[PDB]
């Protein structure tokens, strides 16, 4: 189907304590494959998926080198941003960066993005066309001008339309056995009697990949989407995902309620009947 490759960077300054923390991870779709921790012993880019082991020692040296240059630029950015916003050198702050690309079902480029945030608010981002910038407030307007004068946009277009897609296509092949699979949600349904006139109906979806899924409750064919308790999709820890959605019904009425599961591993949507 569609596929994506994304890199996430997290920089937390730790005043009085030493270097700021720097953590970076990379994902294909919903699978993480590399990590770097500025606190680990190794000080290396490390594998997190079995198929990224196929890459040679030239890969691991090159990525380790690139991640360190990324760390260094954030290390400088924490100071710069502190001055831009006129903040004391005592408070701790967070800088986050995300960037990557998407491809469609033909594995052709769909979109790229590069987003930058400071203390969890949008700071600066590359626009959809990959040629313009969105500046949040005054501090970003300076970084905007500075990055327009340096043609930083054009460096990114090169990566997001080219290098990114070249690599995502390379990883999707090396991980074909797992990245190009779909694990269909195993489903089931529980009935828990709460009151004397009420009961809790819960709809379960287990062991499914990718994480995208839809769980809805229906009554007489109608989405009951104000009376449902739907939990945020959660990792099961083995690569697959979990989700459940529950509703609280007047007893005697269970056969009016039906559960609806839409997943890309399901050829036809499911409908789990109470009967």
């Amino acid at each position, epitope marked *: 189907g569609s596929h994506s490759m994304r890199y996430f960077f997290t920089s937390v300054s730790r005043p009085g304590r030493g270097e700021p923390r720097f953590i970076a991870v990379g994902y294909v779709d919903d699978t993480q494959f590399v990590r770097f921790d500025s606190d680990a012993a190794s000080q290396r880019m490390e594998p997190r998926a079995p198929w990224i082991e196929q890459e040679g020692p030239e890969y691991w040296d090159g990525e380790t080198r690139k991640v360190k240059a990324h760390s260094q630029t954030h290390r400088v950015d924490l100071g710069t941003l502190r001055g831009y916003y006129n903040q004391s050198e005592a408070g701790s702050h967070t800088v986050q960066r995300m960037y990557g690309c998407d491809v469609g*079902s*033909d*594995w*052709r*480029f*769909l*979109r790229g993005y590069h987003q930058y945030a400071y203390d969890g608010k949008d700071y600066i981002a590359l626009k*959809e*066309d990959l040629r313009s910038w969105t500046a949040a407030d005054m501090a970003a307007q300076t970084t905007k001008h500075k990055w327009e004068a340096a043609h930083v946009a054009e460096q990114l277009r090169a990566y997001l*339309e*080219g290098t990114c*897609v*070249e690599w995502l*296509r*390379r990883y*999707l*092949e090396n991980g*074909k056995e797992t990245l*190009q699979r779909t694990d269909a949600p195993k489903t089931h349904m529980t009935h828990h009697a709460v009151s004397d006139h009420e009961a809790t109906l819960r709809c379960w979806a287990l062991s499914f990949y990718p994480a995208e899924i839809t769980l809805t409750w229906q009554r007489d064919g109608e989405d009951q989407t104000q009376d449902t308790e739907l939990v945020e999709t959660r990792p099961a820890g083995d690569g697959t995902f979990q989700k459940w959605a529950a509703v609280v019904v007047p007893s005697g009425q269970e056969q009016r309620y039906t559960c609806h599961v839409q997943h890309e591993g399901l050829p036809k949507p499911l409908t789990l009947r109470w009967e």
Partner: antibody
Framework: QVQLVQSGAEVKKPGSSVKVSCKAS????????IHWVRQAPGQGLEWIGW????????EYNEKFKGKATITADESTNTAYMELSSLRSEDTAVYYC???????????WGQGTLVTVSS | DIQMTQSPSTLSASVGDRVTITCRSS???????????LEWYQQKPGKAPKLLIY???NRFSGVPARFSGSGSGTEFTLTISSLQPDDFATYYC?????????FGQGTKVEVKR
């Protein structure tokens, strides 16, 4: 240093089928679309379809759907175009070409001439 | 299908001449990406084609600088400045923004005498 090398010319009889080969080298075979294009003695160029090795996804020009089959063999770094239900209007030169992330056909094969006559 | 029509159909020029072939699409060739995928090809009789211009105005690796593309929407333009003897051939515009991808009918550039 990219190369697409195509099989030699052929001559067939109406109603039969032919299978042209296209051998790639010099790059990672399984990560770029390979297109097939035809040019009838007439004049213009016309697109047949494409294949992505690795997931073997194929998309055809509706003018040839039901007539062409495009396949690939990763083991040989080789693509195949098999045209069926041959008529005289299928005499042409048949080209395979690779596509670069920018959607453009950058490296072409030499061509294979195919002649359908009784 | 998207109709690609080039103008003119044949063209006779001398070395040093600046030549303009224009390519018109029956509809806009803009992808949901926000890119126009109009390419230009050069063909000599009997030979395989050569890529010249991709994404409307970008030169493919190793192509001379006197070739250039421009335009937007439904009109596209190849310009060959200060023509050279090797440049006498047939030129095709190509789209790829929509299915099916479709070529133009060609433009033959012949020698004038």
């Amino acid at each position: 240093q990219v190369q697409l090398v195509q099989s030699g010319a052929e001559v067939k009889k109406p109603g039969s089928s032919v299978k042209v080969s296209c051998k790639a080298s010099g790059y990672t075979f399984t990560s770029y679309h390979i297109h097939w294009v035809r040019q009838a003695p007439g004049q213009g160029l016309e697109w047949i379809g494409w294949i992505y090795p690795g997931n073997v996804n194929t998309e055809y020009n509706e003018k040839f759907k039901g007539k062409a089959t495009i396949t690939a063999d990763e083991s040989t770094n080789t693509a195949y175009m098999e045209l069926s239900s041959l008529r005289s209007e299928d005499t042409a030169v048949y080209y395979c070409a690779r596509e670069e992330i920018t959607y453009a056909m950058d490296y072409w094969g030499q061509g294979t001439l195919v002649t359908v006559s009784s | 299908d998207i109709q690609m029509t080039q103008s003119p159909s044949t063209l006779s020029a001398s070395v040093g001449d600046r030549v303009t072939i224009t390519c018109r699409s029956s509809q806009s060739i803009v992808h949901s990406n926000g890119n126009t995928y109009l390419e230009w090809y050069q063909q000599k009789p009997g030979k395989a084609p050569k890529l010249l211009i991709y994404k409307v105005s970008n030169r493919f690796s190793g192509v001379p600088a006197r070739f250039s593309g421009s335009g937007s929407g439904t009109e596209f333009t190849l310009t060959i400045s200060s023509l050279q003897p090797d440049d006498f051939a047939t030129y095709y515009c190509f789209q790829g923004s929509h299915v099916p991808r479709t070529f133009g009918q060609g433009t033959k550039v012949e020698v004038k005498r």
